[PDB]
Design a protein around this nucleic acid. Sequence first.
RNA 1: UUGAUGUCACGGAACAGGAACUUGAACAACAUCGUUAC
Length: 76
Amino acid sequence: SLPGKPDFDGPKAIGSQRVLNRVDFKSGKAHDFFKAYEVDHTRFPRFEGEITIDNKVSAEARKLLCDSLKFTDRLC
RNA sequence: UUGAUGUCACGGAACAGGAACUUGAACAACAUCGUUAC
C-alpha cells in the first residue's frame, strides 16, 4: 500500500482513463478496444509491504526467495 | 485491502475517409449654410 496511507477524492485525482485499440492487419483501421486507468510514476513511486516467513522453513529456500525477488522484472 | 497447489494481459497501434475554398479596377466634381423684406 501507499506509505503514509493518505486519502484521495476518487480515481480521477491520481490518474486518467485511456482507451487502448486493437487494429487489424489487411484493412488496417481498427476494431474492439478496451479501457484502463493510467497512473503516473512521478507522483506515486513507492509501495511498501511485508512478508511473514515461518521460523523452521529452511536455510536455502530463503536464498531462492531472495534471488527470485531480485529477478522479477515487471509488475502491474 | 488479497488467500495460496494453477494469473502468457510486455495477449490488443485509438486506428480509418474530408483542398480554409468562393466573390471585389486603390477609385473619384458640384456646391455647403440659413433666413431677410413688407
